[PDB]
Design an enzyme around this catalytic site. Structure first.
Site, PDB file in Angstrom:
ATOM      1  N   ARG A  27       4.474 -10.780  -6.427  1.00 52.89           N
ATOM      2  CA  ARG A  27       4.764 -10.723  -7.868  1.00 52.89           C
ATOM      3  C   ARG A  27       5.443 -12.036  -8.297  1.00 52.89           C
ATOM      4  O   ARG A  27       5.047 -12.623  -9.306  1.00 52.89           O
ATOM      5  CB  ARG A  27       5.712  -9.554  -8.169  1.00 52.89           C
ATOM      6  N   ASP A  49      -0.990 -11.382   3.432  1.00 53.40           N
ATOM      7  CA  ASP A  49      -1.124 -11.051   2.015  1.00 53.40           C
ATOM      8  C   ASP A  49      -0.528 -12.132   1.119  1.00 53.40           C
ATOM      9  O   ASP A  49      -1.041 -12.372   0.028  1.00 53.40           O
ATOM     10  CB  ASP A  49      -0.470  -9.715   1.630  1.00 53.40           C
ATOM     11  N   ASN A  94      -7.193  -8.400   2.352  1.00 50.34           N
ATOM     12  CA  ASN A  94      -7.092  -6.984   1.973  1.00 50.34           C
ATOM     13  C   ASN A  94      -5.770  -6.810   1.226  1.00 50.34           C
ATOM     14  O   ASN A  94      -5.124  -5.781   1.335  1.00 50.34           O
ATOM     15  CB  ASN A  94      -7.122  -6.039   3.195  1.00 50.34           C
ATOM     16  N   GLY A  96      -3.825  -5.917  -1.762  1.00 50.28           N
ATOM     17  CA  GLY A  96      -3.807  -5.249  -3.067  1.00 50.28           C
ATOM     18  C   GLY A  96      -2.906  -5.963  -4.062  1.00 50.28           C
ATOM     19  O   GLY A  96      -3.231  -6.060  -5.272  1.00 50.28           O
ATOM     20  N   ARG A 124     -11.807  -0.262  -1.490  1.00 50.00           N
ATOM     21  CA  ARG A 124     -10.558   0.194  -2.105  1.00 50.00           C
ATOM     22  C   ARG A 124     -10.799   0.181  -3.603  1.00 50.00           C
ATOM     23  O   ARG A 124     -11.208  -0.847  -4.181  1.00 50.00           O
ATOM     24  CB  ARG A 124      -9.402  -0.713  -1.684  1.00 50.00           C
ATOM     25  N   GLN A 171      -0.592   0.135  -8.660  1.00 48.34           N
ATOM     26  CA  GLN A 171      -0.879  -1.298  -8.778  1.00 48.34           C
ATOM     27  C   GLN A 171      -1.704  -1.660 -10.001  1.00 48.34           C
ATOM     28  O   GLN A 171      -1.637  -2.797 -10.459  1.00 48.34           O
ATOM     29  CB  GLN A 171      -1.566  -1.836  -7.520  1.00 48.34           C
ATOM     30  N   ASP A 313       4.572   4.046   1.872  1.00 55.93           N
ATOM     31  CA  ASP A 313       4.423   3.158   3.022  1.00 55.93           C
ATOM     32  C   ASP A 313       5.445   3.490   4.119  1.00 55.93           C
ATOM     33  O   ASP A 313       5.066   3.741   5.271  1.00 55.93           O
ATOM     34  CB  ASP A 313       4.592   1.709   2.554  1.00 55.93           C
ATOM     35  N   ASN A 336      -2.900   9.114  -1.717  1.00 59.11           N
ATOM     36  CA  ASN A 336      -3.425   7.767  -1.742  1.00 59.11           C
ATOM     37  C   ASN A 336      -3.308   7.009  -0.426  1.00 59.11           C
ATOM     38  O   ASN A 336      -3.777   5.890  -0.335  1.00 59.11           O
ATOM     39  CB  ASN A 336      -2.947   6.971  -2.974  1.00 59.11           C
ATOM     40  N   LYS A 340      -5.892   3.155   1.084  1.00 65.13           N
ATOM     41  CA  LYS A 340      -5.138   1.948   1.394  1.00 65.13           C
ATOM     42  C   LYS A 340      -5.752   1.089   2.515  1.00 65.13           C
ATOM     43  O   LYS A 340      -6.991   1.001   2.594  1.00 65.13           O
ATOM     44  CB  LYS A 340      -3.680   2.340   1.613  1.00 65.13           C
ATOM     45  N   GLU A 341      -4.940   0.474   3.362  1.00 63.70           N
ATOM     46  CA  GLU A 341      -5.479  -0.428   4.390  1.00 63.70           C
ATOM     47  C   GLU A 341      -6.578   0.229   5.188  1.00 63.70           C
ATOM     48  O   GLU A 341      -7.524  -0.438   5.628  1.00 63.70           O
ATOM     49  CB  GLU A 341      -4.356  -0.964   5.261  1.00 63.70           C
ATOM     50  N   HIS A 385      -1.794  -3.062   9.628  1.00 64.38           N
ATOM     51  CA  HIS A 385      -0.451  -3.444  10.117  1.00 64.38           C
ATOM     52  C   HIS A 385       0.465  -2.238  10.378  1.00 64.38           C
ATOM     53  O   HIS A 385       1.168  -2.206  11.422  1.00 64.38           O
ATOM     54  CB  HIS A 385       0.248  -4.392   9.102  1.00 64.38           C
ATOM     55  N   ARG A 386       0.508  -1.260   9.472  1.00 66.38           N
ATOM     56  CA  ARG A 386       1.433  -0.129   9.684  1.00 66.38           C
ATOM     57  C   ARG A 386       1.053   0.833  10.775  1.00 66.38           C
ATOM     58  O   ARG A 386       1.911   1.503  11.357  1.00 66.38           O
ATOM     59  CB  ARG A 386       1.707   0.603   8.363  1.00 66.38           C
ATOM     60  N   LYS A 411      -0.403  -8.789   8.451  1.00 60.65           N
ATOM     61  CA  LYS A 411      -0.644  -8.557   7.026  1.00 60.65           C
ATOM     62  C   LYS A 411       0.688  -8.669   6.260  1.00 60.65           C
ATOM     63  O   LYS A 411       0.735  -9.259   5.170  1.00 60.65           O
ATOM     64  CB  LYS A 411      -1.278  -7.174   6.784  1.00 60.65           C
TER      65      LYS A 411
HETATM   66  O1  LIG Z   1       2.926  -2.619  -5.902  1.00 61.51           O
HETATM   67  C1  LIG Z   1       3.189  -2.808  -4.697  1.00 61.51           C
HETATM   68  O2  LIG Z   1       3.801  -3.796  -4.261  1.00 61.51           O
HETATM   69  C2  LIG Z   1       2.732  -1.758  -3.727  1.00 61.51           C
HETATM   70  C3  LIG Z   1       2.509  -0.450  -4.205  1.00 61.51           C
HETATM   71  C4  LIG Z   1       2.038   0.660  -3.320  1.00 61.51           C
HETATM   72  O3  LIG Z   1       0.615   0.996  -3.681  1.00 61.51           O
HETATM   73  P1  LIG Z   1       0.063   2.371  -4.590  1.00 61.51           P
HETATM   74  O4  LIG Z   1       0.613   2.218  -5.934  1.00 61.51           O
HETATM   75  O5  LIG Z   1      -1.417   2.225  -4.586  1.00 61.51           O
HETATM   76  O6  LIG Z   1       0.649   3.517  -3.840  1.00 61.51           O
HETATM   77  C5  LIG Z   1       2.233   0.331  -1.837  1.00 61.51           C
HETATM   78  O7  LIG Z   1       1.603   1.341  -1.082  1.00 61.51           O
HETATM   79  C6  LIG Z   1       1.688  -1.070  -1.523  1.00 61.51           C
HETATM   80  O8  LIG Z   1       1.804  -1.332  -0.140  1.00 61.51           O
HETATM   81  C7  LIG Z   1       2.532  -2.085  -2.338  1.00 61.51           C
END
Ligand SMILES: O=C(O)C1=C[C@@H](OP(=O)(O)O)[C@@H](O)[C@H](O)C1
Length: 427
Positions: A27, A49, A94, A96, A124, A171, A313, A336, A340-341, A385-386, A411
């Protein structure tokens, strides 16, 4: 393929200085790139990332320098929306936090850019975000499967009344919130129904405020944004340590400590995953809070049955910690995990059974009954990664564990195993 075998860890004790937060890092980088002025970020995370975001900014023409360890970044702000034409392709792995925010941000003005990534990223969902951006005027084309990347962005987001579905990913809303202030017209973002992962919206708003922009948040159901704004560099900015990365170490102490202290996060942190410490406390561990640290000391470890939507997470870490708890643990409201990953409900259930647990894979929950004793398994990590970090905790037992593709931790945490080793003691 590559694998790492972890030998049994008799005790954990120590201090870990946390790598920077992935959520805050990506961000801060995008806002610094859009802002006016020079931003100096410190404690920035060096992980895949973040590297994908940095590479995208380079491709878009943003100037910046990185320190030798890549944790200090001096960014020359663009002073407005970023631009590129010619269907420039940005490869976002990958990530997000690069894919969703850039899909929205690059809809400002006119552009002709393609966003793509690894095969899993093309699986995704991003449709809810695309729908909202189109309501605001954006021209977006799905180059492969409808509702998924890759996307061709041709600009046009001017603002207006925009609805967005918040039931699958926060997101999409985060991406809209960061983008809307720079649109020429005012924007009212209405959440259709439920909003998952709400704490991440607070991180977004916190970062936007640091960069000089505030919006009207009406009970997380509607957001009123004034258009024609500009982000402003905050000068120097310290990125919080990563609270999700911290979960593994705090849990390790809850299982096998000792006392493990993580620094870089504390009671005032904006990250919702600091609430993971509250779950360990509910299970029987002892937690100590500081301004810039959180520590966990071994107590008891009892199963819990909780809605984990606020910490999706870090909740995965409770799934493997449950192997060491008394009773059956149930984690609810985590649908959700599937998008995810990897599909984390399928993956977590499959791998937990390999070490002996009885697991019910619910549609949007997981129930885990531990075995009397764990057995050896070669754990598949699903390019996630997790999965690697969560299963590393199996070694806090009498059995070693082999983790396939350990480098997938890069990641968000390239040095994960060296750090777990730092606190691992033989006595
Ligand atoms: O905005 C972010 O930094 C994140 C929001 C989450 O996603 P969701 O909103 O899809 O749960 C989280 O799982 C991701 O690892 C990071």
């Amino acid at each position: 393929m590559e694998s790492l075998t972890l030998q049994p860890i008799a005790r954990v004790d120590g201090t870990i200085n946390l790598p920077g937060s992935k959520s805050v890092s990506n961000r801060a980088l995008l806002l610094a790139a859009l802002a006016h002025g020079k931003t100096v970020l410190t404690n920035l995370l060096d992980s895949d990332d973040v590297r994908h975001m940095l590479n995208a900014l380079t491709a878009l023409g943003v100037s910046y320098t990185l320190s030798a360890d890549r944790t200090r970044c001096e960014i020359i702000g663009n002073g407005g929306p970023l631009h590129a034409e010619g269907a420039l392709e940005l490869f976002l792995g990958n990530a997000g936090t690069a894919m969703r925010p850039l899909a929205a941000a690059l809809c400002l003005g006119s552009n002709d850019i393609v966003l793509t990534g690894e095969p899993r990223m093309k699986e995704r969902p991003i449709g809810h975000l695309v729908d909202a951006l189109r309501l605001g005027g954006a021209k977006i084309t799905y180059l492969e499967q409808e509702n998924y990347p890759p996307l061709r962005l041709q600009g046009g987001f001017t603002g207006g009344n925009v609805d967005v579905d918040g039931s699958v990913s926060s997101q999409f809303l985060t991406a809209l919130l960061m983008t809307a202030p720079l649109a020429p017209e005012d924007t009212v973002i209405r959440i259709k129904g439920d909003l998952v992962s709400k704490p991440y919206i607070d991180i977004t708003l916190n970062l936007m405020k640091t960069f000089g922009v505030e919006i009207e948040n009406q009970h997380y159901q509607q957001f009123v944004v004034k258009g024609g704004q500009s982000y402003q560099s905050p000068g120097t900015y310290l990125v919080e340590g990563d609270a999700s990365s911290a979960s593994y170490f705090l849990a390790a102490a809850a299982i096998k400590g000792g006392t493990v202290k993580v620094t870089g996060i504390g009671r005032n942190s904006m990250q919702g995953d600091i609430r993971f410490a509250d779950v360990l406390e509910k299970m029987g561990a002892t937690i100590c809070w500081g301004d810039d640290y959180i520590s966990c000391t071994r107590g008891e470890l009892n199963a819990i049955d909780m809605d984990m939507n606020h910490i999706p997470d870090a909740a995965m870490t409770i799934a493997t910690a449950a192997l060491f708890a008394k009773g059956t643990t149930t984690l609810r409201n985590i649908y959700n995990w599937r998008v995810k990953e990897t599909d984390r409900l399928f993956a977590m259930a499959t791998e937990l059974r390999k070490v002996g647990a009885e697991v019910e894979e619910g549609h949007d929950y997981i129930r885990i009954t531990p075995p009397e004793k764990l057995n050896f398994a070669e754990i598949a990590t699903y390019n996630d990664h997790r999965m690697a970090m969560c299963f590393s905790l199996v070694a806090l037992s009498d059995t070693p564990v082999t983790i396939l593709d350990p480098k997938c931790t890069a990641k968000t945490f390239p040095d994960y195993f060296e750090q777990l080793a730092r606190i691992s003691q033989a006595a």
